[PDB]
Amino acid sequence: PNFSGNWKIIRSENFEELLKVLGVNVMLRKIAVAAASKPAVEIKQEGDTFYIKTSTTVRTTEINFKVGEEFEEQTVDGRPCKSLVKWESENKMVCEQKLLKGEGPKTSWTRELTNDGELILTMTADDVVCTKVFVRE
């Protein structure tokens, strides 16, 4: 697969409910949901090595990882975690996360290139799943 690109959002579902499970309060959720509505997503892939930059007016994150090698990032609500990405299948990666400190919902994310050329991101906290779909700009 070729995840490389500058990706533009075309669908977002359940992001506020995700932040709810994670315990983000109402006014912060408003800030987050408004900013997350128009993110910029840059992905560079070389083999199983990835760079992913996700930018919004209120928070930007940059991660560098190799599939199968543990790395550190943050949960969507900003808590440090250890992450491990694996290929669930040829076109879908899945990331399991573990908090560095403390307790909280079990979090994960997935990114999949679909047969139509689009990119599906999911982010999960416990049972609640947020789905975002992108196409290259």
Ligand SMILES: CC1=C(/C=C/C(C)=C/C=C/C(C)=C/C(=O)O)C(C)(C)CCC1
């Ligand atoms: C939750 C949250 C905040 C905003 C987080 C944002 C904006 C997350 C964006 C995630 C995206 C954009 C994920 C993706 O699509 O990969 C702010 C800064 C208000 C602080 C309170 C907690």
Ligand code: NA
């Ligand atoms: Na492969």
